[PDB]
Structure formats: structure tokens, C-alpha cells
Design a binder for these strands. Structure first.
Ligand SMILES: [Zn+2]
Ligand SMILES: [Zn+2]
Lengths: 705, 301, 320, 92
DNA sequence: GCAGATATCACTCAGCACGA
DNA sequence: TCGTGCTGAGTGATATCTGCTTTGGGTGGGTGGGTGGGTTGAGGCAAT
């Protein structure tokens, strides 16, 4: 019965689809226009009722799949919408040419039809989130719906050079034309609909590969994780295409006008969240480094030169003769026993022989990494879970347009938008959902970082455009959200708040450096953000970060470095008072075994790391080693192995900037360790096991006296 | 009213709403519309004189107890262009629907004809597009193609299963009926009754067979460019078509150009290549049909 | 009700060098121009020509590549061609989208068959020409040109390019599966609930195929040493370069030297696994090869082919 | 059926192990100012890897170090001895 | 009786939250 | 400030299982054996 019911539903939906309309192949004109059926609006209303009754109330998604299967969106709605746009364009042309000319028979009917198609399209492009309460049917139809939405996005951005965006903009103009005091709630509904349409268009991204885990991993393993439709490639739905289409249709101007006039020509409740989410999605994956630096030839030559060096280093480990040439080495250890190692290269170098003996071992100790995807908690892909280095590549024109748009927005209305959002969500702190918190914090952090970079690069711009960043209310809101996240153990929002706090610290330090005299007002804000509870929380943050994702640890490193820098600056400049704050005690709070463990675990992935991160980790290492003289903390063995791996010819690039810091820190650590070992023979065994916590010998163990 | 019983119009058929032609045709409503239109074309087509060509053709078919109703492609194109286009693009499903419609039309004239024959195959006679064994490419796969060549091989006539019925070896359950494609054998990798991946076997001694023959079609020596190797394919002739040609004949074959996975070819060449063969739908000899044939009128001359 | 884990596409590590080569190729294809008798963009004009005349292959002169960007781009493409080929196609597709959007899709009633166009890049005018005897294993995956005599030409066959399978349990769909050298089927069902892992059915209708032809060539007689058996080689032609080489004549191929494994050992459905007196033992160790060893055989993937050697009005029109 | 070999305190405290390290660790290992830091690190890791292989061939070097960390954190008898060596030096 | 490909079950280990 | 008992998770070893042929051809043989099977025809070259 259920299968028969599904078949009947599919047949009814198909019959409705055929009744919407079709191209007028009969007409001689053969850019075939899409003629409308006599009851087209009836079919639109019927589809709206279908969605309402089935998709939402019955907790099903078969209706959406049936609609997608028959190419309703790509073959019907886009035709009528684009034809309506074209008809309005001709009408405007005639009106401008002659005011008396009026050929728009059934104008009201056309506008109602266009609004209905826009609402239907918005309904069909809503984000899909999988939750624990979702039905099994809601779960089994996730990948198919995601692929259908990807196809929808491609068609939207490609069909007629994306004139759908122009039609939506035209609807927005029609709405705004009427006066503010004359605006009814329906106009605000239409504006919200347009903003949601833009957000949906920007947000659609490829899904995720979910696999059952009832039984063990087969020895065949995973072959591929590709989750794209048949006809859609990555570049079609890339952000570059979105930017190009938006510029071609003059979409950025509409958003600029909407944000500039906010609080002067529009209400705030139907405006704040839409634009805020749109702009969070706009910079969800963008990295500010790319924005501010043929060039491609020079970069290619540099990369080829790096690959050549890597190849040269690899060649040193390969045998001149073929694999089956033979040759067995017998290396005798001091206790009159010899182990056999094969390979030609092992004969000449002892290090290679030992390394091969190591690799030949089969048993591997466990490593358990329990990680939850963002989709599990209903969050989109962003900097939180993306790679530290994943960069979206832009063409020159698209990048220039993106830079211009962001610069104009920041210069125009960032402060007003931030003020409105922060006030609204201070009024409504309690019912915040993780998605909104993460989005708001990420938007704040990204824009503050971009403004900081722009100020650093050039002095023509101003640093006051982010004045609301230092405003007290935003700081209290951010601190409250971070504290609540820490209390409730919500690590995603915790990471977002960590990034936001890092950005706020960078901003405060930069503004104090720029103008110290006016910093007296700034001195008020710093006193608030270094409360005893806040200091304890920041100190504890690195400790827990060891057993989490790499990005969380990177944010921990960033936040710790910024906090230390700001605290040192303020302590040196004047007497810091929240209780007088001395740099010594706060530094001591930061010297603990878990902190060093977290740092070592972070530096274990130096191959994928950037120069700045390496510089910062080694700066903290220098601080711990020298400033406080706690060398006992770093007298571990993982550090020695990591140092040798990084200084090895096959490790970190020799002709690299970080290698200078690595070599200096090594030299110093080796010298101090040799001195201590000569003084204290017992440390020969202490290098392996963790330090004691015994009162009788703890002092001697740590300080050696 | 049952939604599945609703029928579209003729124009709506041209407006296709589906990923592929086969998906569009397979839909219930479109299938019913196609059946109705094909029946109307068969029952209402008239030539210059106004004589119902296909009525007389069906009467003659019944007279000889034949199971083939020859249909002119040009007539279908002139009457309903969209149906001709669908038949060209998706021959298998259109031909299935056409066979059902033709069996209904034949039963219209001879009510009890089902006793003599249960299936009346429909054969397309004059395909406007003529191809050669050299110009066949991947784009022609799974579509009606007309080719010319000379027969240089032929095999004997054998019976082949038309509906198979498998069984299990772990539980002994018997699977349902299936349709045996002429190019690939039926494969089952999981049961439904015991729902186990165990071995299987062919059972159900009750089965309905069909004739099967294979010939090798080669390009005409004259058509081959100067001193180039001729190209050959293998043609499969099903029931009602076996023993219709013998080696050393020039023939024109209209059929479906199909492909299937062959392990031997992949192992040999070293790339994922698929074997290809033509499932014949009609064979003709190569004015008219034969000069030597004469008529009663000529015999008087 | 079930336990599932998810792997995200954003987790993938991108190839920086490949993307840089893609950008360089895009810039070269866009801004390159040659002085005529006027100055015109050779490759933008060529793309417009293809757009008007519906062509798939875009011919690129290697000397032009070497001239621009100090030759670093030429070195990158030539030394490692198999690695960088997909990025070149990505750059070409981006340029086509920028200038000729309609060329991307394949070309009384509507037609739903609109598949992605499979562009092909042909390189010619290589500064050096090799011989079948000069082919070495040190230059596998490099762009080089060879000459030979066509001794045989297999028929045109369809080659599985990007398959599309449907689960036999839940009747799902898995599309865009890349076949390397053998019939490759998916392993894990995308549906979280389904338990299928090895039972799939190929959707022969929704898949995509490419034209395939194998051509055998032997070294030209004069080049051979006195009283020596000619050495043979296998050449593979795809796309629009099929049925261009003909038996007997002498042709100049340009392409990439590849190596074909013994697919039988890797595991083919239906098929069973499996001069030198036992010395030709392959390489073993892979999990797929439980106890068997894999032997290799050199081949050649050619992208360009050159042939070294009615009424009055028709001829007169050809004459200038 | 068979218990897995594991780096217990008994093996560490045997004649081979910590007693072996205390016996001969400074003589074999030598950090020289003239030699580069990489060579000294290689020498130290060379000594410790040889000792670990002689004692615990089961696990690789990094796994051996991690297991040593865990055991030192857990085992109390190991802590007893570790404290004892430090106590003797305080006595010296 | 013998080797190889395959799937099943049982045992032990690192994380977690609470109580001392 | 911290120590330990309970839990889910994942390999390791071990249980059943299929398979143990396979194959056309003379650098795989005839002490592996015909109940595992192999049934050309044109064209070139030495002898004369
Ligand atoms: Zn069964
Ligand atoms: Zn499945």
C-alpha cells in the first residue's frame, strides 16, 4: 500500500508538472518562449499545498524528490520567472520611451505568478539538516536531495546567465519603491523571502559521504567519497561562479543599498538576521590572506624548485640497482648480537638501516579519533572543520570585485549591522541556537581580521570602521556566549568564541599601539576582559585542547599567544588592575604539563602547518624555556623525536624560514640538556616517564636543587 | 478517478520532463498516451487512395498465421512525428508498447487470434538514416540503426529461454519469472525468500522457448574505401527471423545497437571495453524488392 | 537505529602545484596572441571557431607553450603530463565558461540528453621526434612524439569512462565512478542504513562511453639496424582521433607514454587470474594480489596524429 | 587463548631495562659541541632505540615511548623506584 | 590432505563520569 | 585538588567455506592420461 501510495503521489505530481505550461513550439519565433497554461497559478497553488501537507506535517520528503525527478525547477519555474523578468524589462523600456505606452495586460496576474514561483523556489532550496528526531524516511533520502539541490544551484547560476537573481532584485525594487510608513507586513515578508532566496543560493554545497558501520572495514576499503551529481562538476558550483554571476547581474549593489539604508528606511527585525547570515555564508570559506598579497609563472617556478628539492632528497634513499639485486647487511649491537637488514642503501648509512629496521615492525599501537561532522550538529562547512591551508582560488576580475564589495560594505554599514544584531540578540540571549551563535561569532571574527589586515597593509583606510567591535555590549555578549559554551561543553561554539576573542585581542592591541593617549578609554575595556574567572577559563582552554581537532588546537595557540602579548604589553606600560595583575603569576598559570602536551601534539603536524604557526609555537617554547626557566617541562622524549624529524634532510625544508627558529631552539635545548644530564645522572631515566609529584624529591627533580 | 488512468494530449508528449527518453516513456500516463496514439495511427492511417493500409496488412498477417506486422517509418513520422522520434531514440520500450498495441489491433479483426500466436512483433521497414559498419560510434548505442553489409557466417537454429525461473541451493526456494535478454545472461546475487547470498540453479521445467540464431555481417567490398580492412559485426536473430538469409547475400539490417560487459575483452585489450552486437528487428535483401518477381498483370503481357 | 560515520569532501588535501599550473594554462590560453600579416588571439579565436562549428578537440602548438612564461609551463607539462592533464582540462573548461558558455554542454520538441562535453587537448609540433627503439622506462608519463608504420588497426569500441551503479538492496544510485584500467565497482553504499558492500548493477543507460581504437605500429624499415626484427608497439586513440591512422602508411603520433598492468591479476569479474624462462616475475605485495604478482607492459596514449605519407566546380572551389 | 606480550613494570625493572640504562647510558651517548645538533639527536635516539629493541621488540620507537609514558603514569611500583633514584642523589 | 579467500566471535583496552 | 570502576569499540585468531583447475598448444610433456579435449587451406620455397 505504501509503495502504491508513493506511485500515486509521483503520478499526480507528474501530471501537475505537465499542467504548469510548456514552450510554444508552434510559434514561428524559435527562441521558444515559455507560454503559460490557462490555470498555471492553480498548479502553483496546488504544489504549494502539496509541500505544506506532505513535506512538513507528515515529516516526509518524497514530494521534493518527485518534484526534482521531473525537472520542475530547471524546466518550468526558471522559464516563467525569466520570461516575467524580460516582460518587465520591455515594459520599463516602453515606459521610459513613452509614458503613455502601457502594454502589460493582466499585470497583477503576472506579479502574483512571479511571487508564487519565487516562494516555491525558496521552499525548494531550503537547507536540509539531519537530526536525531528525523524519521527513517527523512534519513534515507538525504544524498539524493543534496544532489538535486546541487543541480538546482548549477541551473540557477547558469540558466540565461543567472537572470533569476535580476528578477529577484526587480521584486526587491518593486517592494522598496513604496514609502516606509506606507509599508505593510507583506512587503517585509517579500523582502525576507528575497534575502532567504539569496542565502539559499549561496549556501548550497556538496553533501557528505555517510557509510554504515555495522561490521568491520573490509580489506577492499573505501574506493572514493565523491558525492556529486552526474552532470555537475566542482567548478560549476564553486564560489567563483557565484561571484561572477552576482557581478554580471549587479547583485552586490542591492545588498549594499539594503545595508546602507538600514535603520533609516527599513525595519530591523525582518532585515538583521537575513543579511547577517548571507554575509556569514559569503565569507564562510574565504581566507583573508588571499585577498591581500606573470605572477602565476613565478609561483609555478618556485613550486617546481621546491618539488625538485624534495625529489633530490628522496633520491638519496633509493638504490641505484634494481629491487632484486640483493645484498644483506648484518649490524651488530654492542651486546654481541647482529640483526639482518636488507637493501643496498642500508649498507652505507647506519641511520637508514635503523630506520628500515624500525619500519619492518608490524604491530601498531591504537589511535582512536572520535570526531563528529558539522552536519551531525546542524552546522555548515566552514573554517571550523576545513584544512589550515585550503584556499578558494579566484580569478583576477572576480577577486577584484570581491575586494571592492567587501571594502565598500565595511566602509559603509558594518557598524550599524553589528549594533542592530548585538542589541537584538542581547534581548534574546536565552533562545539562541548553536547555528546562530557560531554564525554571528564567525562573521564578527572574519570582518575584524579583514579590517586589521587592510589597516596593516595600507594607511589610506581607517580603523574606526569597526568601532562597534570595541563597544562594550558586543564584548559582554561574546564573553557570555563563550562562558555558556564552556559551561555546557559545546565545543563548536567554544571554538568560534575562541576565534572571536583572539580577533578582539588583536584589535585592542592594534588600537592601543596606534594611539596610546586615547587608549585610556581602551584601558577600561581590558580591565573587564581579564577577570579572574576569565583568566582561569583561558588558562584551562589549552589544557583540554589536546584531545580535539587540529583547528581547535590552532585556535588555542593563537588565543594563548595573543593573551600573553596583551598581558605583557599592559603590565609593562602601567599597573594592570582588573586585584593587581602581575605577569609572573599569569605566566605560571600557563606552565603546565597538559599545555606542553597540547603544543607537542600540534607541532606533530608541522608538514601541513604554515610559517606563522611554527614561529608562534617556537616563540612560546622559548618563553617557557628562558623567561621562566622551567626546562624540566620540555625535557621529554616526544620533543626530541620531533626535533630530529624536523631537522632531518627529508623533514622540514632546509632553505626555509622556520628552520632558523628550529635550529636555534634545538641548539639551546641540547646544550641545556647536556649540562643537566652531566649534573644529574638520574635524568637518563627521567626523560621517558612523566615528572613526579612527590614533595620529598619534587623540588630536586624539577629545579635540580 | 484513479490518477494512474489519466491520459495526456499529443502535444504534451513532445514536452519531455525527465532525465532521459526511456524514463519519460516508462511513466504510466505517458505509456497509456503512447498506446492510444499508436492505436489511433494504426486504425486511422490512409494512403492517397484512402484505403486503410494497416487494416489490410493485419488481415493478410492473420491469413498467413504470421507474427510480424511490417510498419513503415515514413507513415509514422508523417502522422505523429513525436512518436517516430521516440521510437528512433528509445527503440526497446517503444517497440514493446507497439507490440502490445498491434496485438490489440490484430485481436480487433480476429478475436481469437491469441490461440494461434500470443505475440505479434512490429518491424520497422524504411529507416531514413542509413549507417555503415565503419561509422558506428558510441553515440549510436541503444538506438535504432540501419546498416548495410554482406553475410559471411551463420549458425544453426537453437531454442533459447524466453522466461526463466531460478532456485536456491541453501534453502531450495524458487525465484519468480524473469525476462532473458538476448545479449547477457540473467544474474542473481541475492535471494528474496531465504535472503542469502548462496549459490543458485536453473529450475522450473515449465518454460517457454524461442528460436535464436547468429550471423556475421560484413561491409560490402565495394563500399570499403581503397584497400582498407572491412569491418564486421555480429547480428542476433530471434524468433520469426531465423533462416531468413544465407551466406553470400547483401542485406540491410534494422535493429538496436546494444553493448554489454565482456570479461575476455577487458583481459585481452587491457582497458574497460564492452562487446557490441546488433539485435535484429528486420532484415531485407538488396528496383522495389526483386526484379525477377512478376505480377498477374505482367503474366498477361 | 544504526551506526554511521561520515567523511567530508572538504577534508581533501588539494594539489597546490596542479592549481598553479591550471592558472598558468588558463592565462596562456586567454592572453596569447601572434602577430598576423594585425594581432589576434589565436586560442580565443580557436575556441570561438569550435563554438560555431561544434568541435571537441582544441589543438595547441607546443612552440607557443615554450615561448610563454620562460618555458616553465612547457617543462611542467612535458616532464609530468599524466599528473597535470586533469588540471589543464579544468583550466580549458574555465576559459570556455568565461568566453563560450554554451560550448560546455553537448549539442519541434525538447531534448533532455544534455551531457557534459568531454573536451580533449591535442599537442603537436614537438621539437623532437623519437623512435620505437628509443622508448625507455625513464620517460613514463612524459609528453613525447614518435613515428612508425601502421601494421594493424582494431575496430572502434566503446570504453567505459564514468559508470553509474544502482544498489541491489535499496535501489540507490552511485554515479561518476572512475575506471582506471579494469571494471571497477563501488564498495560502500551511500545510504546510511543499507548494508550492501559488493552487490551492484551497472546502469548501462546512464553511463558514459568513449570511442576506443588500438593501433599497432612498427619502426620504419630504414631506421632499423641491418638484419634486425622490427620492434612493435601498441597505440591507443580516443575521441575524435579514431579512424585517422590507416594500415600501411607512416604517421607521427604525439602523446603520453603509459604502462598497462595485467588486469587479470587485479581481479576481473568472471575472468580467472593468469622467451623468458621464469625470470619475468612481476611485483607482489598489494592486498588485492593476495599471492599473485603483477607484470607490466608499455603502451602509448596518443592525442595527435599526422599522416607523413569530383566535378569541376568542387575542385575549383578548393583552389585559391 | 594466549595473553598478549605487554610492557609491564616487571620487564622494565628486570636486569635488562632501567638497570641496563643506568649502568651504561652516559658512556655510549655523547653530545658534542663540534658536531651538529642533528647528529647528537640521532646518536641519542640511536642508543634509546637499540635499547628498546633489545628490551621490547614488539613495539616501534614512538609506540614504545608512548607505552612508557602510560606505564609511568599508571604503575605505582615504577614510581617507587623512580622516586628512589632521585632520593639516592639527594643523599649523594 | 592441502593452500587461499572469507567472515565470525571473543577479549581487552582507552575514555568517561562520578565519588573520595 | 584528584582515583578508579563501567562501557563501547575494534582487531586477532580462528571457524566455516570454496576450491583443489585450466587450458589450448608443442620451449609445458607422454613414467599425468584420452570418459578433459584437438577433424584447415592458401601461398611460398626447395628440389628438380
Ligand atoms: Zn534462497
Ligand atoms: Zn544500498
Amino acid at each position: 500500500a505504501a509503495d502504491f501510495s508513493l506511485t500515486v503521489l509521483r503520478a499526480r505530481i507528474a501530471l501537475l508538472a505537465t499542467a504548469i505550461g510548456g514552450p510554444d513550439y508552434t510559434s514561428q519565433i524559435d527562441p521558444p518562449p515559455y507560454k503559460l497554461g490557462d490555470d498555471c497559478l492553480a498548479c502553483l497553488k496546488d504544489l504549494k499545498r502539496w509541500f505544506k501537507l506532505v513535506d512538513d506535517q507528515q515529516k516526509r520528503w518524497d514530494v521534493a524528490m518527485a518534484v526534482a525527478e521531473y525537472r520542475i525547477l530547471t524546466d518550468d519555474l526558471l522559464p516563467i520567472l525569466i520570461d516575467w523578468e524580460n516582460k518587465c524589462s520591455l515594459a520599463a523600456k516602453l515606459a521610459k520611451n513613452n509614458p503613455d505606452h502601457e502594454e502589460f495586460r493582466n499585470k497583477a496576474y503576472y506579479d502574483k505568478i512571479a511571487l508564487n514561483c519565487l516562494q516555491l523556489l525558496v521552499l525548494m532550496t531550503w537547507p536540509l539538516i539531519v537530526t536525531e528526531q528525523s524519521s527513517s524516511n527523512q534519513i534515507t533520502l538525504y544524498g539524493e536531495l543534496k544532489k538535486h539541490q546541487l543541480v538546482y544551484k548549477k541551473t540557477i547560476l547558469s540558466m540565461e546567465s543567472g537572470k533569476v537573481l535580476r528578477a529577484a532584485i526587480r521584486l526587491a525594487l518593486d517592494v522598496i519603491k513604496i514609502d516606509r510608513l506606507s509599508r505593510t507586513p507583506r512587503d517585509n515578508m517579500v523582502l525576507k523571502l528575497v534575502l532567504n532566496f539569496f542565502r539559499n543560493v549561496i549556501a548550497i554545497e556538496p553533501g557528505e559521504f555517510t557509510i554504515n558501520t555495522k561490521k568491520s572495514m573490509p580489506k577492499k576499503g573505501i574506493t572514493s567519497i565523491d558525492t556529486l551529481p552526474p552532470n555537475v562538476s566542482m567548478d560549476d558550483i564553486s564560489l567563483n561562479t557565484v561571484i561572477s554571476s552576482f557581478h554580471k547581474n549587479k547583485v552586490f549593489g542591492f545588498l549594499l543599498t539594503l545595508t546602507s539604508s538600514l535603520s533609516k528606511e527599513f525595519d530591523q527585525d525582518f532585515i538583521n538576521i537575513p543579511l547577517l547570515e548571507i554575509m556569514f555564508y559569503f565569507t564562510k570559506d574565504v581566507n583573508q590572506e588571499l585577498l591581500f598579497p606573470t605572477s602565476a609563472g613565478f609561483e609555478l617556478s618556485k613550486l617546481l624548485q621546491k618539488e625538485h628539492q624534495m625529489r633530490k632528497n628522496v633520491i638519496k634513499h633509493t638504490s641505484a640497482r634494481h629491487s632484486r639485486f640483493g645484498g644483506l647487511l648484518s649490524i651488530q649491537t654492542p651486546d654481541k648480537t647482529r640483526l639482518t637488514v636488507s637493501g643496498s642503501q642500508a649498507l652505507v648509512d647506519e641511520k637508514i638501516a635503523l630506520q628500515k629496521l624500525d619500519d619492518s615492525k608490524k604491530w601498531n599501537k591504537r589511535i582512536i579519533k572520535k570526531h563528529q561532522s558539522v552536519a551531525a550538529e546542524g552546522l555548515p562547512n566552514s573554517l571550523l572543520n576545513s584544512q589550515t591551508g585550503k584556499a578558494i582560488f579566484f580569478t583576477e576580475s572576480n577577486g577584484k570585485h570581491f575586494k571592492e564589495f567587501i571594502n565598500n560594505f565595511i566602509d559603509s554599514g558594518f557598524n550599524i549591522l553589528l549594533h542592530s544584531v548585538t542589541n537584538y540578540f542581547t534581548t534574546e540571549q536565552d533562545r539562541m541556537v548553536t547555528l546562530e551563535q557560531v554564525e554571528y561569532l564567525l562573521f564578527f571574527a572574519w570582518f575584524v581580521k579583514y579590517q586589521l589586515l587592510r589597516s596593516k597593509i595600507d594607511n589610506s583606510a581607517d580603523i574606526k570602521q569597526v568601532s562597534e567591535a570595541l563597544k562594550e555590549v558586543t564584548f559582554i555578549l561574546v564573553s557570555s556566549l563563550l562562558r555558556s559554551a564552556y559551561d555546557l561543553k559545546n565545543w563548536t561554539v567554544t571554538h568560534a568564541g575562541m576565534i572571536a576573542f583572539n580577533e578582539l585581542l588583536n584589535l585592542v592591541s592594534r588600537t592601543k599601539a596606534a594611539q596610546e593617549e586615547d587608549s585610556t578609554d581602551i584601558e577600561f575595556i581590558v580591565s573587564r576582559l581579564f577577570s579572574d574567572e576569565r583568566i582561569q577559563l583561558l588558562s584551562n582552554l589549552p589544557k583540554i585542547g589536546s584531545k580535539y581537532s587540529l583547528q581547535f588546537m590552532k585556535s588555542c595557540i593563537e588565543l594563548t599567544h595573543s593573551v600573553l602579548k596583551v598581558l605583557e604589553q599592559y603590565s609593562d606600560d602601567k599597573t594592570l588592575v582588573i586585584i593587581e595583575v602581575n605577569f609572573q603569576k599569569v605566566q605560571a598559570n600557563y606552565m603546565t604539563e597538559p599545555v606542553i602536551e597540547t603544543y607537542i601534539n600540534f607541532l606533530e603536524r608541522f608538514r601541513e602547518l604554515e610559517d606563522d604557526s611554527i614561529k608562534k609555537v617556537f616563540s612560546f617554547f622559548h618563553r617557557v624555556f628562558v623567561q621562566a626557566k622551567e626546562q624540566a617541562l620540555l625535557f621529554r622524549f616526544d620533543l626530541i623525536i620531533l626535533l630530529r624529524e624536523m631537522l632531518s634532510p627529508d623533514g622540514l625544508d632546509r632553505m626555509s624560514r622556520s628552520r632558523k627558529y628550529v635550529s636555534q631552539f634545538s641548539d639551546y635545548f641540547l646544550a641545556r640538556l647536556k649540562k643537566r644530564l652531566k649534573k644529574s645522572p638520574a635524568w637518563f631515566v627521567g626523560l621517558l616517564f612523566p615528572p613526579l609529584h612527590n614533595s620529598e624529591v619534587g623540588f630536586y627533580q624539577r629545579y635540580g636543587e | 478517478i484513479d490518477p494512474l488512468r489519466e491520459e495526456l494530449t499529443l502535444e504534451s508528449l513532445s514536452n519531455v520532463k525527465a532525465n532521459s527518453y526511456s524514463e519519460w516513456i516508462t511513466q504510466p500516463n505517458v505509456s497509456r498516451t503512447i498506446a492510444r496514439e499508436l492505436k489511433s495511427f494504426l486504425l486511422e492511417y490512409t494512403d492517397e487512395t484512402g484505403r486503410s493500409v494497416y487494416g489490410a496488412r493485419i488481415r493478410t498477417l492473420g491469413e498467413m498465421n504470421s507474427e510480424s506486422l511490417e510498419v513503415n517509418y515514413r507513415h509514422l513520422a508523417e502522422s505523429k512525428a513525436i512518436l517516430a522520434l521516440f521510437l528512433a531514440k528509445c527503440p526497446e520500450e517503444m517497440l514493446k508498447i507497439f507490440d502490445l498495441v498491434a496485438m490489440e489491433a490484430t485481436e480487433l479483426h480476429y478475436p481469437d487470434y491469441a490461440r494461434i500466436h500470443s505475440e505479434i512483433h512490429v518491424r520497422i521497414s524504411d529507416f531514413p538514416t542509413i549507417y555503415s559498419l565503419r561509422e558506428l560510434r558510441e553515440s549510436n548505442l541503444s538506438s535504432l540503426v540501419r546498416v548495410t553489409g554482406v553475410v559471411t557466417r551463420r549458425t544453426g537454429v537453437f531454442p533459447q529461454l524466453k522466461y526463466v525461473k531460478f532456485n536456491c541451493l541453501k534453502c531450495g526456494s524458487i525465484l519468480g519469472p524473469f525476462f532473458q535478454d538476448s545479449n547477457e545472461e540473467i544474474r542473481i546475487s541475492f535471494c528474496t525468500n531465504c535472503k542469502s547470498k548462496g549459490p543458485f540453479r536453473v529450475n522450473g521445467e515449465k518454460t517457454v522457448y524461442r528460436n535464436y540464431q547468429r550471423v556475421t555481417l560484413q561491409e560490402a567490398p565495394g563500399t570499403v574505401p581503397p584497400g582498407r580492412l572491412p569491418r564486421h559485426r555480429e547480428v542476433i536473430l530471434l524468433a520469426d527471423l531465423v533462416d531468413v538469409s544465407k551466406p553470400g547475400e547483401e542485406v540491410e539490417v534494422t535493429g538496436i545497437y546494444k553493448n554489454n560487459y565482456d570479461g575476455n575483452l577487458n583481459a585481452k585489450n587491457g582497458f574497460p571495453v564492452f562487446a557490441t552486437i546488433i539485435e535484429a528487428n528486420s532484415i531485407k535483401r538488396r528496383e522495389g524488392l526483386d526484379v525477377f518477381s512478376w505480377t498477374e498483370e505482367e503474366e498477361r503481357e | 537505529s544504526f551506526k554511521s560515520r561520515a567523511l567530508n569532501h572538504v577534508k581533501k588535501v588539494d594539489d597546490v602545484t596542479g592549481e598553479k599550473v591550471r592558472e598558468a594554462f588558463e592565462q596562456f590560453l586567454e592572453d596569447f596572441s601572434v602577430q598576423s600579416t594585425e594581432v589576434e588571439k589565436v586560442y580565443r579565436a580557436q575556441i570561438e571557431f569550435m563554438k560555431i562549428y561544434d568541435l571537441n578537440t582544441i589543438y595547441i602548438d607546443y612552440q607557443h607553450l615554450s615561448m610563454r612564461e620562460n618555458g616553465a609551463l612547457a617543462m611542467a607539462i612535458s616532464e609530468q603530463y599524466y599528473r597535470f592533464l586533469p588540471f589543464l582540462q579544468k583550466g580549458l573548461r574555465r576559459v570556455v565558461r568565461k568566453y563560450a558558455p554554451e560550448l560546455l554542454n553537448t549539442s519541434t520538441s525538447t531534448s533532455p540528453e544534455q551531457t557534459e562535453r568531454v573536451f580533449q587537448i591535442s599537442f603537436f609540433n614537438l621539437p623532437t621526434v623519437h623512435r620505437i627503439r628509443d622508448i625507455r622506462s625513464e620517460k613514463i608519463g612524459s609528453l613525447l612524439s614518435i613515428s612508425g608504420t601502421v601494421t594493424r588497426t582494431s575496430e572502434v569500441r566503446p570504453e567505459l569512462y564514468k559508470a553509474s551503479f544502482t544498489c541491489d538492496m535499496c535501489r540507490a544510485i552511485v554515479d561518476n565512478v572512475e575506471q582506471s584500467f579494469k571494471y571497477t565497482e563501488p564498495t560502500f553504499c551511500p545510504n546510511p542504513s543499507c548494508e550492501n558492500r559488493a552487490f551492484w548493477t551497472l546502469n548501462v543507460t546512464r553511463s558514459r562511453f568513449l570511442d576506443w581504437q588500438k593501433v599497432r605500429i612498427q619502426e620504419n624499415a630504414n631506421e632499423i639496424p641491418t638484419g634486425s626484427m622490427p620492434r612493435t608497439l601498441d597505440v591507443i586513440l580516443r575521441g575524435d582521433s579514431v579512424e585517422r591512422a590507416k594500415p600501411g602508411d607512416r604517421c607521427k603520433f604525439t602523446g603520453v607514454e603509459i604502462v598497462v598492468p595485467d588486469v587479470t591479476q587485479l581481479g576481473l569479474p568472471g575472468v580467472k587470474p593468469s622467451t623468458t624462462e621464469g625470470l619475468n616475475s612481476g611485483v607482489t605485495g598489494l592486498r588485492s594480489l593476495g599471492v599473485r604478482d603483477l607484470t607490466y607492459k608499455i603502451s602509448f596514449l596518443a592525442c595527435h596524429v599526422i599522416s607523413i605519407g569530383r566535378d569541376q566546380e568542387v575542385f575549383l572551389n578548393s583552389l585559391s | 587463548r594466549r595473553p598478549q606480550v605487554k610492557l609491564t613494570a616487571e620487564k622494565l625493572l628486570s636486569d635488562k631495562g632501567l638497570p641496563y640504562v643506568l649502568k651504561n647510558a652516559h658512556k655510549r651517548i655523547r653530545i658534542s659541541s663540534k658536531k651538529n645538533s642533528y647528529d647528537n639527536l640521532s646518536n641519542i635516539i640511536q642508543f634509546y632505540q637499540l635499547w628498546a629493541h633489545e628490551l621490547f621488540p614488539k613495539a616501534k620507537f614512538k609506540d614504545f615511548m608512548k607505552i612508557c609514558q602510560t606505564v609511568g603514569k599508571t604503575d605505582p611500583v615504577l614510581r617507587e623506584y623512580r622516586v628512589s633514584l632521585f632520593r639516592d642523589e639527594m643523599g649523594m
